[PDB]
Symmetry: C2
Subunit: 221 residues, 2 copies
């Protein structure tokens, strides 16, 4: 095969971080969108999904499922996983923290009006007092342009991506962090990244209250 094929709904979800990593690596990919329960059913019946779930990416002869397994394979393949196990330990701990932040904010648009109020307050609290400070500290610790090993790795991309989501959430959360503001602007200028950020790329938008309801009355939800 030529281009990796990404199987997922036409939405951000768990596949967006993979789109970002391939984009950053400069690797062109195709997407086969799951538009209906029938598309999903067919994917399962034809033996495409190990645990009957997506994300699933066809690459180098594999039908690879599980977000993290896919990200790990792609980062290794395109030299975005650092130079050794020690740098990989830092890249992994940092990336896992970013995934947790992403989920904590991402779950909000699901909270029952009686729950969201406090959950949002907790997320903003965690964002400005737990996560942003941790990454601002990493940058401050070595004063280098990238998070690990003074060279671009997958986690610089994951961090840029989640900062964008933090900005969509509450732009003010980011103000106390000068080093993250600089980092965000630096990574966004990389050629491959700038191209993904441009209108018309395969980058996905966030989903508005209604929009989602559809997807519920679109599949099991």
């Amino acid at each position: 095969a030529g281009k990796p094929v990404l199987h997922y709904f036409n939405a951000r979800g768990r596949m967006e971080c993979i789109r970002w990593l391939l984009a950053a690596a400069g690797v062109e990919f195709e997407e086969k969108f799951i538009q209906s329960p029938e598309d999903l059913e067919k994917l399962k019946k034809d033996g495409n999904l190990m645990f009957d779930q997506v994300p699933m990416v066809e690459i180098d002869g594999m039908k690879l499922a599980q977000t993290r397994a896919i990200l790990n394979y792609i980062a290794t393949k395109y030299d975005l996983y650092g130079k050794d196990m020690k740098e990989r330990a830092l890249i992994d701990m940092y990336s896992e923290g970013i995934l947790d932040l992403t989920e904590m904010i991402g779950q909000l648009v699901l909270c029952p009006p009686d729950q969201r109020e406090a959950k949002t307050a907790l997320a903003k609290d965690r964002t400005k007092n737990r996560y942003l400070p941790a990454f601002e500290k990493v940058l401050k610790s070595h004063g280098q342009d990238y998070l690990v090993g003074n060279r671009l790795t997958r986690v610089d991309i994951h961090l840029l991506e989640v900062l964008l989501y933090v900005e969509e959430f509450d732009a003010s959360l980011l103000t106390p962090f000068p080093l993250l503001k600089a980092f965000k602007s630096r990574i966004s200028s990389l050629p491959n990244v700038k191209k993904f950020l441009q209108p018309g790329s395969q980058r996905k938008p966030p989903m508005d209250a209604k929009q989602i309801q559809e997807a519920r009355k679109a599949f099991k939800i």
Copy 2:
């Protein structure tokens, strides 16, 4: 330093998969248990926890947090991560499915009482119709003793461990799967595993009801 130091509550939680990997690898470790919230607070205040969370393991000079980061580092260090990136893709995909299954069962203990029965029936349904069939198939596909690469890897250990929890959950779920029954017995006989399974090892038991709430009437949440 010397032995790895594991920072966690005196319970299974997210640290158990890590205790299991080190035991299988024949690596001796120490544990510093978090007995009270005052214990946890100190760990945070002293800056040893990147995101003020545990599991955290002191190994090779690092204060490594995030379960998956720790597991990936330990697996690579002790040659339990396969031989190449393709093997690691399968290892990762399989392990993520195991982690998902583990969480699905484990979280039941936290369900609001009015949701627990529905949640439990789903977890049982997923266990017998999605996860166990998927792993039985991997073993049947190549007919070999191990899941990946015809050689012991971290995921063989992850699978033995989650098979034990499935047995605790509902032993009847495991009866229709012959190759998994055989796999379980086989991995259980390896020297280092048999020793971890024996009484008096650092392996952890499930928490009981009173214990679950008591641990609640103990910390925050």
